[PDB]
Write an enzyme that holds these catalytic residues in place. Structure first.
Site, PDB file in Angstrom:
ATOM      1  N   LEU A  38       2.896  34.035 -50.870  1.00 42.94           N
ATOM      2  CA  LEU A  38       2.995  32.583 -51.346  1.00 42.94           C
ATOM      3  C   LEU A  38       3.354  31.929 -50.143  1.00 42.94           C
ATOM      4  O   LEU A  38       2.793  30.794 -49.918  1.00 42.94           O
ATOM      5  CB  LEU A  38       4.030  32.485 -52.319  1.00 42.94           C
ATOM      6  N   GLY A  39       4.249  32.283 -49.470  1.00 39.24           N
ATOM      7  CA  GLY A  39       4.912  31.551 -47.919  1.00 39.24           C
ATOM      8  C   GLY A  39       6.082  32.466 -47.426  1.00 39.24           C
ATOM      9  O   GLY A  39       6.482  33.329 -48.038  1.00 39.24           O
ATOM     10  N   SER A  40       6.351  32.013 -46.238  1.00 35.30           N
ATOM     11  CA  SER A  40       7.109  32.653 -45.355  1.00 35.30           C
ATOM     12  C   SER A  40       7.927  31.339 -44.624  1.00 35.30           C
ATOM     13  O   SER A  40       7.502  30.251 -44.605  1.00 35.30           O
ATOM     14  CB  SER A  40       6.565  33.429 -44.236  1.00 35.30           C
ATOM     15  N   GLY A  41       9.297  31.788 -44.270  1.00 35.02           N
ATOM     16  CA  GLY A  41      10.069  30.923 -43.601  1.00 35.02           C
ATOM     17  C   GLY A  41      11.433  31.726 -43.158  1.00 35.02           C
ATOM     18  O   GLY A  41      11.340  32.874 -43.079  1.00 35.02           O
ATOM     19  N   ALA A  42      12.542  30.760 -42.925  1.00 32.27           N
ATOM     20  CA  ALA A  42      13.815  31.345 -42.771  1.00 32.27           C
ATOM     21  C   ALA A  42      14.370  32.209 -43.808  1.00 32.27           C
ATOM     22  O   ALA A  42      15.132  33.002 -43.582  1.00 32.27           O
ATOM     23  CB  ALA A  42      14.807  30.271 -42.534  1.00 32.27           C
ATOM     24  N   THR A  98       9.875  36.426 -46.536  1.00 33.89           N
ATOM     25  CA  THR A  98       8.533  36.158 -47.139  1.00 33.89           C
ATOM     26  C   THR A  98       8.715  36.304 -48.632  1.00 33.89           C
ATOM     27  O   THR A  98       9.091  37.206 -49.201  1.00 33.89           O
ATOM     28  CB  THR A  98       7.560  37.466 -46.641  1.00 33.89           C
ATOM     29  N   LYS A 141      10.737  38.668 -52.990  1.00 30.79           N
ATOM     30  CA  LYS A 141      11.286  38.230 -51.672  1.00 30.79           C
ATOM     31  C   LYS A 141      11.514  39.551 -50.886  1.00 30.79           C
ATOM     32  O   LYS A 141      12.293  40.466 -51.252  1.00 30.79           O
ATOM     33  CB  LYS A 141      12.532  37.244 -51.996  1.00 30.79           C
ATOM     34  N   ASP A 175      24.771  27.722 -49.866  1.00 33.80           N
ATOM     35  CA  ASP A 175      23.471  27.300 -49.427  1.00 33.80           C
ATOM     36  C   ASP A 175      22.539  26.392 -50.415  1.00 33.80           C
ATOM     37  O   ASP A 175      21.550  26.555 -50.376  1.00 33.80           O
ATOM     38  CB  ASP A 175      22.407  28.409 -48.978  1.00 33.80           C
ATOM     39  N   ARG A 199      15.942  22.866 -50.716  1.00 28.45           N
ATOM     40  CA  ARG A 199      14.841  24.075 -50.550  1.00 28.45           C
ATOM     41  C   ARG A 199      15.175  25.266 -51.458  1.00 28.45           C
ATOM     42  O   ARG A 199      14.312  26.094 -51.522  1.00 28.45           O
ATOM     43  CB  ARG A 199      14.933  24.306 -49.005  1.00 28.45           C
TER      44      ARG A 199
HETATM   45  C1  LIG Z   1      10.464  25.905 -50.581  1.00 25.22           C
HETATM   46  C2  LIG Z   1       9.153  26.496 -50.625  1.00 25.22           C
HETATM   47  C3  LIG Z   1       9.127  27.691 -51.424  1.00 25.22           C
HETATM   48  O1  LIG Z   1       9.928  28.173 -51.776  1.00 25.22           O
HETATM   49  N1  LIG Z   1       7.738  28.294 -51.452  1.00 25.22           N
HETATM   50  C4  LIG Z   1       6.684  27.306 -51.115  1.00 25.22           C
HETATM   51  C5  LIG Z   1       5.481  28.328 -51.303  1.00 25.22           C
HETATM   52  C6  LIG Z   1       5.961  29.055 -52.630  1.00 25.22           C
HETATM   53  C7  LIG Z   1       7.349  29.644 -52.152  1.00 25.22           C
HETATM   54  C8  LIG Z   1       7.633  30.339 -50.982  1.00 25.22           C
HETATM   55  C9  LIG Z   1       8.022  29.871 -53.422  1.00 25.22           C
HETATM   56  C10 LIG Z   1       8.761  30.444 -54.286  1.00 25.22           C
HETATM   57  C11 LIG Z   1       9.270  30.840 -55.573  1.00 25.22           C
HETATM   58  C12 LIG Z   1       8.526  31.063 -56.642  1.00 25.22           C
HETATM   59  N2  LIG Z   1       9.029  31.472 -57.558  1.00 25.22           N
HETATM   60  C13 LIG Z   1      10.205  31.940 -57.845  1.00 25.22           C
HETATM   61  C14 LIG Z   1      11.043  32.283 -56.484  1.00 25.22           C
HETATM   62  C15 LIG Z   1      10.500  31.580 -55.479  1.00 25.22           C
HETATM   63  C16 LIG Z   1      11.429  31.626 -53.957  1.00 25.22           C
HETATM   64  N3  LIG Z   1      11.273  30.485 -53.096  1.00 25.22           N
HETATM   65  C17 LIG Z   1      12.322  30.501 -52.135  1.00 25.22           C
HETATM   66  C18 LIG Z   1      13.328  31.214 -52.902  1.00 25.22           C
HETATM   67  C19 LIG Z   1      14.562  31.857 -52.082  1.00 25.22           C
HETATM   68  O2  LIG Z   1      15.281  32.457 -52.524  1.00 25.22           O
HETATM   69  N4  LIG Z   1      14.483  31.072 -51.097  1.00 25.22           N
HETATM   70  C20 LIG Z   1      13.822  29.667 -50.573  1.00 25.22           C
HETATM   71  C21 LIG Z   1      12.444  29.959 -51.046  1.00 25.22           C
HETATM   72  C22 LIG Z   1      12.970  32.005 -54.065  1.00 25.22           C
HETATM   73  N5  LIG Z   1      13.420  32.798 -54.520  1.00 25.22           N
HETATM   74  C23 LIG Z   1      13.300  34.132 -55.019  1.00 25.22           C
HETATM   75  C24 LIG Z   1      11.997  34.624 -54.746  1.00 25.22           C
HETATM   76  C25 LIG Z   1      11.798  36.048 -55.226  1.00 25.22           C
HETATM   77  C26 LIG Z   1      12.477  36.927 -55.569  1.00 25.22           C
HETATM   78  C27 LIG Z   1      14.080  36.253 -55.682  1.00 25.22           C
HETATM   79 CL1  LIG Z   1      15.448  37.279 -56.585  1.00 25.22          CL
HETATM   80  C28 LIG Z   1      14.324  35.087 -55.654  1.00 25.22           C
HETATM   81  O3  LIG Z   1      15.341  34.460 -55.762  1.00 25.22           O
HETATM   82  C29 LIG Z   1      16.582  35.027 -55.142  1.00 25.22           C
HETATM   83  C30 LIG Z   1      10.719  24.956 -49.352  1.00 25.22           C
HETATM   84  N6  LIG Z   1      10.981  25.716 -48.173  1.00 25.22           N
HETATM   85  C31 LIG Z   1      11.283  24.899 -47.187  1.00 25.22           C
HETATM   86  C32 LIG Z   1      11.880  26.902 -48.389  1.00 25.22           C
HETATM   87 NA    NA Z   2      18.018  34.674 -46.666  1.00 22.76          NA
END
Ligand SMILES: */C(=C\C(=O)N1CCC[C@]1(C)C#Cc1cnccc1[C@H]1NC2=C(C(=O)NCC2)[C@@H]1Nc1cccc(Cl)c1OC)CN(C)C
Ligand code: NA
Ligand code: NA
Length: 308
Positions: A18-22, A25, A45, A135, A139
């Site tokens: 779906l996406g990557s960043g700080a 993935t 994640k 945090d 975002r």
């Molecule tokens: C945010 C963008 C963003 O989060 N995006 C854009 C493209 C899709 C993605 C990566 C996403 C998502 C998403 C969708 N459904 C559920 C969870 C998540 C997820 N996204 C993020 C999570 C996170 O912990 N940090 C920030 C981004 C998040 N959480 C998840 C994912 C998988 C498993 C677990 Cl347990 C969980 O929560 C802990 C803006 N960007 C600048 C960050």
């Molecule tokens: Na982290």
């Protein structure tokens, strides 16, 4: 008691990035639990490889799973592949920071104030579980539907022991522009420093995803806050809304609002939304809702090493 459902990798199919960043993935997938017929959409994640960090996040989330809260992301389990992965229910509308930037032209005052109420409800639940998130930011808020958001990312979160009112950090990377002054100066984190971050998160929503202190180096932020400077008033905010943000950014942590108080004040504002936020064409805006017959159509560096 923290428990972890280990889900077999064979139970997941159609995994796609779906996406990557700080944050590492994140992928989407379909979890088919063994001995069941339902295919559940999930988000998965991983970190860019280390396994201690992701298990610490799993522990914290599992520790606050009972009773849980509608505005707090729940951990479904972990998966052991080449790396350790966390599993949660897919939030199909993504993160709230991207959502506010992409739908600025249809976000009315009722949505913005309801998101403020919901984040304060999730944070009040976390405070009741002795959890300091560390945090909170737009975002790290996810959108289940435009009317329902959840707090995510427990990578920096810490549980306070029975006889502890604060968490003292070591030298790991932290989000300076979302942090309370005492956290930047002394590495001290409390429920009241999460209130400071909540104020920054509200400012991010009210500006439709502007970057806070844009073009100002993170190393100058403590001096700017010591001089009494803060984030500017967003043009849609009436004075009572901006005053909530300014109270969240008070020097004295104990004088800042409490999450329980923020739930009440933002709920009052959500009862007369156009009085508190002034948005051109507000009554003509609409975002998909599960009660709409066609809702199914819609479903088709910030972190730095501390210097002080
Ligand atoms: C945010 C963008 C963003 O989060 N995006 C854009 C493209 C899709 C993605 C990566 C996403 C998502 C998403 C969708 N459904 C559920 C969870 C998540 C997820 N996204 C993020 C999570 C996170 O912990 N940090 C920030 C981004 C998040 N959480 C998840 C994912 C998988 C498993 C677990 Cl347990 C969980 O929560 C802990 C803006 N960007 C600048 C960050
Ligand atoms: Na982290
Ligand atoms: Na007070």
């Amino acid at each position: 008691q923290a428990l972890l459902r280990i889900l077999k990798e064979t139970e997941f199919k159609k995994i796609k990035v779906l996406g990557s960043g700080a944050f590492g993935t994140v992928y989407k997938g379909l979890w088919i639990p063994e001995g069941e017929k339902v295919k559940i959409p999930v988000a998965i994640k991983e970190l860019r490889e280390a396994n201690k960090e992701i298990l610490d996040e799993a522990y914290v989330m599992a520790s606050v799973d009972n009773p849980g809260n509608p505005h707090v992301c729940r951990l479904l389990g972990i998966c052991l592949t080449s790396t350790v992965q966390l599993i949660t229910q897919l939030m199909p509308f993504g993160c709230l920071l991207d959502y506010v930037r992409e739908h600025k032209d249809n976000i009315g005052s009722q949505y913005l104030l309801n998101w403020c109420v919901q984040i304060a409800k999730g944070m009040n639940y976390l405070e009741d579980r002795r959890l300091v998130h560390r945090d909170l930011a737009a975002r790290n808020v996810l959108v289940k539907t435009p009317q329902h958001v959840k707090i995510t990312d427990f990578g920096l979160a810490k549980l306070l022991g029975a006889e502890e009112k604060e968490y003292h950090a070591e030298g790991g990377k932290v989000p300076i522009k979302w942090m309370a002054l005492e956290s930047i100066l002394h590495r001290i984190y409390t429920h009241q420093s999460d209130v400071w971050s909540y104020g920054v998160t509200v400012w991010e929503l009210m500006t439709f995803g502007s970057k806070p202190y844009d073009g100002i180096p993170a190393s100058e932020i403590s001096s700017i806050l010591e001089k009494g400077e803060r984030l500017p008033q967003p043009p849609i905010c009436t004075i009572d809304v901006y005053m909530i943000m300014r109270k969240c950014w008070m020097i004295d942590a104990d004088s800042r609002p409490k999450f329980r108080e923020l739930i009440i004040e933002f709920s009052k504002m959500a009862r007369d939304p156009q009085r508190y936020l002034v948005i051109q064409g507000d009554e003509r805006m609409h975002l998909p809702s599960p009660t709409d017959s066609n809702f199914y159509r819609a479903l088709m560096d910030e972190y730095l090493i501390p210097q002080q």
